[PDB]
Amino acid sequence: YYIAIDIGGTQIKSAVIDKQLNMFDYQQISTPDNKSELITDKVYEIVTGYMKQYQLIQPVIGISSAGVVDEQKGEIVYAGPTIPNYKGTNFKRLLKSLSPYVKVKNDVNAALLGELKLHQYQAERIFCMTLGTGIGGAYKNNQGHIDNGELHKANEVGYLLYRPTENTTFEQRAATSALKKRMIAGGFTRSTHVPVLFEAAEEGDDIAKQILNEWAEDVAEGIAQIQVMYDPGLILIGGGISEQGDNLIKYIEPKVAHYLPKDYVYAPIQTTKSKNDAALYGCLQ
Amino acid sequence: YYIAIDIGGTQIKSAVIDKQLNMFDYQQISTPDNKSELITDKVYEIVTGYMKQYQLIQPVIGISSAGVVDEQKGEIVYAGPTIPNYKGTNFKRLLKSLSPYVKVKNDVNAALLGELKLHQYQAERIFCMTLGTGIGGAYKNNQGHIDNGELHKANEVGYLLYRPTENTTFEQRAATSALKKRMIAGGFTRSTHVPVLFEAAEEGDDIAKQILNEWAEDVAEGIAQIQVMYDPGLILIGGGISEQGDNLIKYIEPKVAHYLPKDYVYAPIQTTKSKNDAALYGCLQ
Numbered sequence: 429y430y431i432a433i434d435i436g437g438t439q440i441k442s443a444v445i446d447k448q449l450n451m452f453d454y455q456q457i458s459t460p461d462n463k464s465e466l467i468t469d470k471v472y473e474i475v476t477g478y479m480k481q482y483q484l485i486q487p488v489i490g491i492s493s494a495g496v497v498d499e500q501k502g503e504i505v506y507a508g509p510t511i512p513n514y515k516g517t518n519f520k521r522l523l524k525s526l527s528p529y530v531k532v533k534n535d536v537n538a539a540l541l542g543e544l545k546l547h548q549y550q551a552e553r554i555f556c557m558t559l560g561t562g563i564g565g566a567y568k569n570n571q572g573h574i575d576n577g578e579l580h581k582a583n584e585v586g587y588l589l590y591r592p593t594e595n596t597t598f599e600q601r602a603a604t605s606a607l608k609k610r611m612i613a614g615g616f617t618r619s620t621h622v623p624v625l626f627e628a629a630e631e632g633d634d635i636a637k638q639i640l641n642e643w644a645e646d647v648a649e650g651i652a653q654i655q656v657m658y659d660p661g662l663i664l665i666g667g668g669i670s671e672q673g674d675n676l677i678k679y680i681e682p683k684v685a686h687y688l689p690k691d692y693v694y695a696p697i698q699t700t701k702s703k704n705d706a707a708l709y710g711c712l713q
Numbered sequence: 714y715y716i717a718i719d720i721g722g723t724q725i726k727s728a729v730i731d732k733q734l735n736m737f738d739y740q741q742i743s744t745p746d747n748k749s750e751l752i753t754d755k756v757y758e759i760v761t762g763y764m765k766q767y768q769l770i771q772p773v774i775g776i777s778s779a780g781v782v783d784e785q786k787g788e789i790v791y792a793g794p795t796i797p798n799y800k801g802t803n804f805k806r807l808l809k810s811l812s813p814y815v816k817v818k819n820d821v822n823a824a825l826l827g828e829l830k831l832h833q834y835q836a837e838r839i840f841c842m843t844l845g846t847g848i849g850g851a852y853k854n855n856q857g858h859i860d861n862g863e864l865h866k867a868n869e870v871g872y873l874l875y876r877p878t879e880n881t882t883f884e885q886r887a888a889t890s891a892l893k894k895r896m897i898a899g900g901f902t903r904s905t906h907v908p909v910l911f912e913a914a915e916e917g918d919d920i921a922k923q924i925l926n927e928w929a930e931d932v933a934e935g936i937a938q939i940q941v942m943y944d945p946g947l948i949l950i951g952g953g954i955s956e957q958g959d960n961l962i963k964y965i966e967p968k969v970a971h972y973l974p975k976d977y978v979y980a981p982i983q984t985t986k987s988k989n990d991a992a993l994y995g996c997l998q
């Protein structure tokens with residue numbers, strides 16, 4: 429049995445996984461604020477809880493986490509403000525008395541590797557962008573490798589497209605909290621729950637549609653820059669919002685052409701086929 | 714003896730090169746408009762001229778060219794408007810009765826490879842951006858490869874940052890023709906020659922300075938997107954303008970921080986040490 433743990437700003441998910449990739453004992457808790465209740469403390473108790481439940485000695489532990497991960501060190505070496513005080517968090521050191529077999533990866537690295545372990549694709553070059561609390565990226569290159577860059581922060585695509593006159597990055601315009609502000613800013617008051625926004629647009633609510641289009645325009649703009657850099661065979665959209673599937677793609681994919689030359693052929697854009705668990709599988713790779 | 718030919722929008726450069734990388738018989742002609750005088754005709758006669766001069770049978774011919782290059786086909790498979798009617802140009806077919814040993818690479822691929830053959834760098838990941846007629850890119854990754862993407866158009870960074878309200882791409886704001894327009898638009902007195910603009914700014918010309926800064930702002934904005942995607946160890950600026958050296962860098966490098974978070978560490982930005990000839994060496998690599 430392997431222990432998998434996926435750390436986001438909103439939730440920590442975890443599971444025990446066996447050799448055949450079967451998931452047991454899936455758990456999902458609210459992420460501690462990391463001020464008075466610490467993420468490391470919760471991760472440690474998640475691990476010890478599985479070790480106690482299953483009488484595990486030195487379990488192989490995979491950690492997927494938001495933030496820039498130095499994978500060799502097992503450490504958060506750079507972190508946006510979604511998780512405060514997160515830089516310097518070293519999960520290998522944290523867990524060393526429980527196990528010497530700890531891997532740590534960025535959450536999008538894990539999502540992509542998990543997606544690719546569960547689903548085959550023809551494309552040789554696959555970029556994954558997650559839309560959720562944050563926006564993150566990972567790129568599986570031609571030779572099968574996911575490179576994290578010289579300082580491990582490659583594909584932090586949330587930092588794309590900083591607009592000086594608006595003081596926003598890509599992530600500050602397209603992340604869940606930004607979309608929720610756009611909803612209330614755009615007069616959508618039925619709810620503040622993103623799925624309801626999509627449901628309203630599907631049943632022909634013009635305010636839901638205008639908010640979604642204006643948001644998908646900014647999302648498409650970010651995808652276009654990834655496209656231009658990488659020219660990938662495939663762009664996967666993951667994260668919580670990926671549950672919309674084609675109802676999400678239909679807003680974003682046509683708009684990518686707005687930021688590309690008229691004759692420029694860009695990669696197909698699809699949601700991840702595994703919606704929730706991709707990172708739990710990927711963090712063991 | 715190898716034949717090297719480097720095709721830009723403005724100039725075609727060529728030379729004969731021997732095993733020790735000594736360059737002989739360097740030539741430089743104005744690039745035909747590719748309307749009534751054809752680039753292929755000039756390349757063919759450049760090759761036959763070298764073949765006769767040196768009595769070369771089936772010479773190895775390296776071709777470096779602006780445009781998206783399918784290296785295996787030896788073909789321009791996509792070309793922006795800097796060179797008209799260029800899509801479909803196949804240099805292997807063009808030269809097949811002269812030689813079966815023809816290589817074709819994108820001009821920035823060749824510039825980077827030539828640069829790296831002449832100069833060693835600490836960085837493992839090196840991005841090269843050329844500023845000139847067009848703007849182009851190439852990235853030597855961790856494992857030493859330069860990947861051209863799924864459809865060979867990776868790192869065509871001139872298409873970055875399309876602004877719908879201005880109808881401009883990165884290249885349409887930062888390429889030479891754009892800088893000259895900015896010079897004329899900005900009231901600049903002395904000339905419309907980019908070297909003169911830099912000389913004027915060095916001699917305390919406030920209009921030259923303002924034009925350079927506003928343009929360097931747009932260049933830095935593009936460099937920042939490359940930085941965010943790749944997190945490279947080094948960003949080389951090539952093209953004719955690289956001969957300005959630190960007088961170019963000093964305008965562009967500090968401004969890259971404007972499009973990145975306050976604590977974000979970006980790569981050193983340097984000009985290529987090879988100023989004119991990098992691509993002639995690179996197209997044989």
Ligand SMILES: CC(=O)N[C@H]1[C@@H](O)[C@H](O)[C@@H](CO)O[C@@H]1O
Nearest residue numbers: 494495496507508536562563564
């Ligand atoms: C700390 C940080 O910069 N996190 C990014 C990235 O690391 C995550 O992968 C992405 C998804 O959560 O958005 C996050 O904003």
Ligand SMILES: CC(=O)N[C@H]1[C@@H](O)[C@H](O)[C@@H](CO)O[C@@H]1O
Nearest residue numbers: 779780781792793821847848849
């Ligand atoms: C035909 C085309 O689109 N060329 C790009 C790119 O291929 C070149 O590498 C770059 C440098 O000349 O500018 C060019 O604009």
